[PDB]
Amino acid sequence: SMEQVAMELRLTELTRLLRSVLDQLQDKDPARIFAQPVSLKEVPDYLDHIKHPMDFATMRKRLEAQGYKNLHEFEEDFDLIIDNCMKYNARDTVFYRAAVRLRDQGGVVLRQARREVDSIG
C-alpha cells in the first residue's frame, strides 16, 4: 500500500535523525568507555549484576536495522548505557565519572532531538 510506504519513509527519516543523534552522543565519550559491550571474558560475573547490557555498537546495529520506532526507544537504550555503568562501578572510578559526563552532555543533545522529532513529525 501507499500508506505502508509512507510509514516506511517516516521510519527512514527517523533513522537518519537518530544516526546523527547517536554520533553526537558518542562524541561525548572521547575515551570510548561505552563504545563496545562489556566483555564477558574480562568481566565474567557481569550478567549477575546487570540484566540488560547496552553499549553504542549494539545501539548502532539496532539503528541500521531500523529497529527504533520512536525516540523514546532510543533514549531507553542510551539511559541503559549510563544507568548500568553507575550501578556496576563505584562513584570514585573513571567509569562512573565518564557516565555522569555523558549523561550531562547528552541531555543537551536529546533536549533538541525531542523538539526535532515532534517538529518534523
Side-chain angles (χ1 to χ4, degrees), residues 4-6 8 11-15 17-40 42-60 62-68 70-110:
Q4 289 293 328
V5 166
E8 293 160 3
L11 177 61
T12 300
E13 285 308 286
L14 176 65
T15 303
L17 182 157
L18 297 179
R19 192 182 297 121
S20 166
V21 176
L22 180 62
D23 293 344
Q24 281 176 79
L25 296 172
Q26 187 150 27
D27 290 335
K28 308 308 174 152
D29 172 34
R32 299 191 74 82
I33 292 163
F34 308 104
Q36 294 293 327
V38 173
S39 175
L40 306 175
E42 297 155 13
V43 189
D45 79 344
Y46 189 63
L47 301 186
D48 294 343
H49 293 268
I50 297 295
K51 298 299 171 181
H52 299 95
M54 196 41 59
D55 66 271
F56 287 131
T58 300
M59 295 191 59
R60 203 175 289 285
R62 185 163 164 191
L63 183 63
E64 293 310 329
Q66 299 190 345
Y68 296 112
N70 58 51
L71 179 61
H72 183 71
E73 289 189 350
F74 176 100
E75 292 173 307
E76 282 189 329
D77 271 356
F78 176 68
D79 283 342
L80 272 179
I81 292 175
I82 297 310
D83 293 337
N84 285 348
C85 185
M86 298 172 69
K87 291 167 192 65
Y88 190 80
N89 303 110
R91 224 156 25 251
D92 76 323
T93 61
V94 60
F95 309 107
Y96 185 111
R97 289 164 174 287
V100 166
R101 291 163 64 82
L102 179 63
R103 189 195 63 182
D104 284 353
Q105 293 199 281
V108 178
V109 169
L110 289 173

